[PDB]
């Protein structure tokens, strides 16, 4: 209905509020998508004022002068609250300041924690002693909802569930806010098309792959820490095999949907070495700018640093649907492109009369970027000729849906918060196996030391993990070619 | 493929000839496609000479005037003999033309019979005396319409076979010689996508379609005597239900090939009046020329003709695959477009987690015009929504093969017949069975003269066939929108 909502950024002064939370709250606003009464109040150390965090983050609005009317209703419902995120007066103030808004005692709060993660259990404990409503509901978003090992997490995670319910807690993954991803279930469940071909029968092997063509740029340090695997593969990699490979829901449901998802993982067995490739971007002498240095030539790395900055690793599903058909996480930065892809290589037709003249049939479904989904198969070759060559069936977000704004993962995610659906938000449980899959990997890489794979800054990476993809059951022709059409 | 062969266009004077089959036959040479040693000899009842039948037919080459250097090579090797078709002196005459001509006696020859078919046993007679090779290959090809019902077909179809063998007959129904239909066979036997779906537990319907949006033009006469039945579906749409419906054959040879097509056609009943809609076009008073006056008011078309002009047909195929799926023949003239089309239409998914937002997923394989082929599925609609909703995975030959000539249905099939490949040519016993499914349903409307439902022209037809359709388990709601992606 229209009840009252506050949004409470904590964090308002960092950089994950500034550049992205404060415009993001905004977009939903501007476009009508909040509750009518709501209200943001941002927390942070400094002693700011709201015209202080408008100077600040306005500049990421991309506010056009017809928006001005809208961009002062916004800034009238913002406020700010200075304190320490151990201090429990700071967050009396902060109770009490929430508690002065608009029937405030009766409002729905939400806790976006934009933080740095050394600080959740502290923010958390004091959330759940000074600030809940008694009348409204209470949920805290947790951004970085992995810790730095096995032990740290559950800790971190026992922490925040002895406090919190977990109908509460909301952990961002944000690739399940985006667009094709969302979009798996529906391609999946909602098409016969799609339905009988979707099992160890058919699928030869599936590829779940993270590029960007840029590197560390300078803030290697931060990386070094964790590592590709930690970054790219554990959570949003992951996310994506879940959506693939999971069995039907009972229901749309985020518990139905969620259950699912964590079966899907108890049935992948722990990562073996076997199975991965790891690799370091080094520079490329005839590039230009970034191109030219290395993981190692950026000074806030370690000297000597083993950190992997691409990845491929094979998991297998054990269960009746999947048994035996390799997933291949696949990600890296300084690669050659900018891509996020979902892949399925389905098997050769049986009783061939083409005389090996066909190749696999493919699904591709792109999430990033220009949106897309098609399907590579055969069509007899146009024109007067007999023999089959590949082809494919296509939809292009950009092309067909020309006029449709695709919103960014965090407009659609802090919504889904206001909504409380929890479908595309990471679950304690599956959280807790995704610790389990990589968490021997990751002790055995921090134990051994092993020296990464060189790779020149602006490749496909590693020749190595190409051979590995072939050797699980990956076949790559080069055959295929394609033109853009609606160009 | 270095040997000799002579092109004998049986009737060159004749229109087939002079607007299909000369132009066919050049473009094939002029492409590079026959055999060096090619001849080509016209026959027909007038005194002309190769200047004449140039004339005549230039006009429908669409010849460059870069071209001028192979067409001067195309008609050195024309000639034109003249005779009656059933007269055998006429006929030794042309037998020792083509002695004369370079290694003539050894030549492969291939006699496209481009005549009236009131003629075909005279002419059939003649030449399996007379005019074949005693060392190369002989080969016919005829044209339809093979008989008007199962009596008449079968008598001209023994006469035929009592002096050709089957392996020397090449029956032609065009639509077989067209990009797309060729295209099914690679579309369901090379693909795994295709492959598990493609069977009773997942398709609701088939849909064959054909739809011109021109009436008689009027020539009504010729066509009161066949009907859109004869005309259009006992040989197009069958021909495609049979390449939809047929098992995966041994082999891509001709025989195995057809012998899949007569297996699906021996398993269909003879199809019951209760599942057939007729129509016949009436004028449309608000539209202009052509579209104004109905089958009736052309005065060539006999008065009080109850001829159907729009069909709808629903048949079934008895076996494994498709025991129960509807296959729904639809053609007709005077509609609303030019189409010909397959449509797959898949059943609900079960256990719909969706609210029934779902609609049932289509594969379209479009003939002409535009050829494509897409399926219309589910997405998540785009934008901040969580809903489903219609779209479609997208392939178009205009678009994606911008370059590329896909030839005339007749250049391929004239090659097809060079080669020896009889795999896109009705065999006895496919003509034998479509005789068998149609007879009694033809005699029927002959005896019982039903007056067909009117239309009007420019319309999509009876709205009964739509009933029909529904009835039998198609369905439509109209909610797809599709914007062309340019
Ligand atoms: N709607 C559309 O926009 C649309 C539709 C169809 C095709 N296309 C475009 O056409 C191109 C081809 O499409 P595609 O990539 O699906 O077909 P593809 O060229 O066959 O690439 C398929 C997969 O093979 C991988 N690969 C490349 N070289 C390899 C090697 N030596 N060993 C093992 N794997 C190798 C690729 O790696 P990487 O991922 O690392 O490249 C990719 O994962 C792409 O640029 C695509 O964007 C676009
Ligand atoms: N690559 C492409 O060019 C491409 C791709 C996708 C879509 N499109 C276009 O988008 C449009 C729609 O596509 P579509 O025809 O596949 O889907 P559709 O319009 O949903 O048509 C589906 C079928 O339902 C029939 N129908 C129409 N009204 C009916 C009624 N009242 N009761 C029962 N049946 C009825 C149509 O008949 P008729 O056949 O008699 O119309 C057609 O056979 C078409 O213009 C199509 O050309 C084009």
């Given at each position: 209905?229209?009840?009252?909502?506050?949004?409470?950024?904590?964090?308002?002064?960092?950089?994950?509020?500034?550049?992205?939370?404060?415009?993001?709250?905004?977009?939903?606003?501007?476009?009508?998508?909040?509750?009518?009464?709501?209200?943001?109040?941002?927390?942070?150390?400094?002693?700011?004022?709201?015209?202080?965090?408008?100077?600040?983050?306005?500049?990421?609005?991309?506010?056009?002068?017809?928006?001005?009317?809208?961009?002062?209703?916004?800034?009238?419902?913002?406020?700010?609250?200075?304190?320490?995120?151990?201090?429990?007066?700071?967050?009396?103030?902060?109770?009490?300041?929430?508690?002065?808004?608009?029937?405030?005692?009766?409002?729905?709060?939400?806790?976006?924690?934009?933080?740095?993660?050394?600080?959740?259990?502290?923010?958390?404990?004091?959330?759940?002693?000074?600030?809940?409503?008694?009348?409204?509901?209470?949920?805290?978003?947790?951004?970085?909802?992995?810790?730095?090992?096995l032990?740290?997490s559950d800790?971190?995670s026992?922490?925040?569930?002895?406090?919190?319910?977990e109908?509460?807690?909301?952990?961002?993954?944000?690739?399940?806010?985006?667009?094709?991803?969302?979009?798996?279930?529906?391609?999946?469940?909602?098409?016969?098309?799609?339905?009988?071909?979707?099992?160890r029968?058919?699928?030869?092997?599936?590829?779940?792959?993270?590029?960007?063509?840029?590197?560390?740029?300078?803030?290697?340090?931060?990386?070094?820490?964790?590592?590709?695997?930690?970054?790219?593969?554990q959570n949003?990699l992951l996310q994506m095999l879940c959506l693939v490979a999971m069995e039907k829901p009972a229901?749309?449901?985020?518990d139905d949907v969620r259950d699912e998802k964590v079966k899907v993982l108890k049935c992948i067995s722990e990562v073996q070495?076997?199975?991965?490739?790891?690799?370091?971007?080094?520079?490329?002498?005839?590039?230009?700018?970034?191109?030219?240095?290395?993981?190692?030539?950026?000074?806030?790395?370690?000297?000597?640093?083993?950190?992997?900055?691409?990845?491929?690793?094979?998991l297998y599903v054990e269960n009746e649907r999947w048994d035996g058909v390799?997933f291949?996480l696949?990600?890296?930065?300084?690669?050659?492109?900018?891509?996020?892809?979902?892949?399925?290589?389905?098997?050769?037709?049986?009783?061939?009369?083409?005389?090996?003249?066909?190749?696999?049939?493919?699904?591709?479904?792109?999430?990033?970027?220009?949106?897309?989904?098609?399907?590579?198969?055969?069509?007899?070759?146009?024109?007067?000729?007999?023999?089959?060559?590949?082809?494919?069936?296509?939809?292009?977000?950009?092309?067909?849906?020309?006029?449709?704004?695709?919103?960014?993962?965090?407009?659609?995610?802090?919504?889904?918060?206001?909504?409380?659906?929890?479908?595309?938000?990471v679950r304690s449980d599956e959280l807790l196996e995704a610790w389990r899959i990589f968490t021997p990997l990751?002790?055995?890489?921090?134990?051994?030391?092993?020296?990464?794979?060189?790779?020149?800054?602006?490749?496909?990476?590693?020749?190595?993990?190409?051979?590995?993809?072939?050797?699980?059951?990956?076949?790559?022709?080069?055959?295929?070619?394609?033109?853009?059409?609606?160009?």
């Amino acid at each position: 209905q229209s009840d009252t909502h506050i949004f409470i950024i904590m964090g308002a002064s960092g950089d994950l509020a500034k550049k992205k939370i404060y415009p993001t709250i905004w977009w939903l606003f501007r476009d009508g998508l909040l509750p009518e009464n709501t209200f943001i109040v941002g927390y942070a150390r400094s002693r700011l004022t709201v015209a202080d965090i408008r100077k600040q983050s306005e500049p990421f609005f991309k506010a056009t002068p017809e928006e001005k009317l809208k961009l002062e209703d916004f800034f009238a419902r913002n406020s700010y609250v200075a304190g320490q995120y151990d201090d429990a007066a700071s967050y009396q103030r902060l109770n009490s300041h929430m508690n002065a808004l608009h029937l405030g005692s009766q409002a729905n709060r939400l806790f976006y924690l934009a933080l740095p993660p050394t600080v959740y259990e502290a923010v958390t404990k004091n959330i759940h002693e000074s600030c809940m409503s008694q009348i409204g509901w209470n949920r805290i978003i947790v951004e970085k909802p992995f810790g730095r090992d096995l032990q740290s997490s559950d800790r971190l995670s026992n922490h925040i569930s002895s406090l919190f319910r977990e109908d509460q807690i909301y952990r961002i993954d944000h690739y399940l806010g985006k667009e094709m991803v969302q979009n798996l279930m529906v391609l999946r469940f909602a098409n016969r098309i799609f339905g009988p071909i979707w099992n160890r029968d058919n699928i030869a092997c599936v590829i779940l792959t993270f590029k960007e063509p840029f590197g560390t740029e300078g803030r290697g340090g931060y990386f070094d820490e964790f590592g590709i695997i930690r970054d790219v593969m554990q959570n949003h990699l992951l996310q994506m095999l879940c959506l693939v490979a999971m069995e039907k829901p009972a229901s749309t449901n985020s518990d139905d949907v969620r259950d699912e998802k964590v079966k899907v993982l108890k049935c992948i067995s722990e990562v073996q070495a076997n199975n991965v490739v790891l690799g370091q971007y080094v520079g490329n002498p005839d590039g230009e700018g970034e191109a030219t240095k290395g993981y190692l030539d950026d000074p806030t790395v370690p000297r000597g640093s083993t950190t992997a900055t691409f990845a491929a690793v094979v998991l297998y599903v054990e269960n009746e649907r999947w048994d035996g058909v390799p997933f291949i996480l696949r990600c890296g930065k300084a690669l050659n492109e900018r891509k996020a892809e979902v892949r399925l290589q389905f098997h050769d037709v049986a009783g061939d009369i083409f005389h090996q003249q066909c190749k696999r049939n493919e699904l591709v479904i792109r999430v990033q970027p220009n949106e897309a989904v098609y399907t590579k198969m055969m069509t007899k070759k146009p024109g007067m000729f007999f023999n089959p060559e590949e082809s494919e069936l296509d939809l292009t977000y950009g092309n067909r849906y020309k006029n449709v704004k695709l919103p960014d993962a965090y407009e659609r995610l802090i919504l889904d918060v206001f909504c409380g659906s929890q479908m595309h938000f990471v679950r304690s449980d599956e959280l807790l196996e995704a610790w389990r899959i990589f968490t021997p990997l990751l002790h055995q890489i921090e134990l051994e030391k092993p020296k990464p794979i060189p790779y020149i800054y602006g490749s496909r990476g590693p020749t190595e993990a190409d051979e590995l993809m072939k050797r699980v059951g990956f076949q790559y022709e080069g055959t295929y070619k394609w033109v853009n059409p609606h160009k």
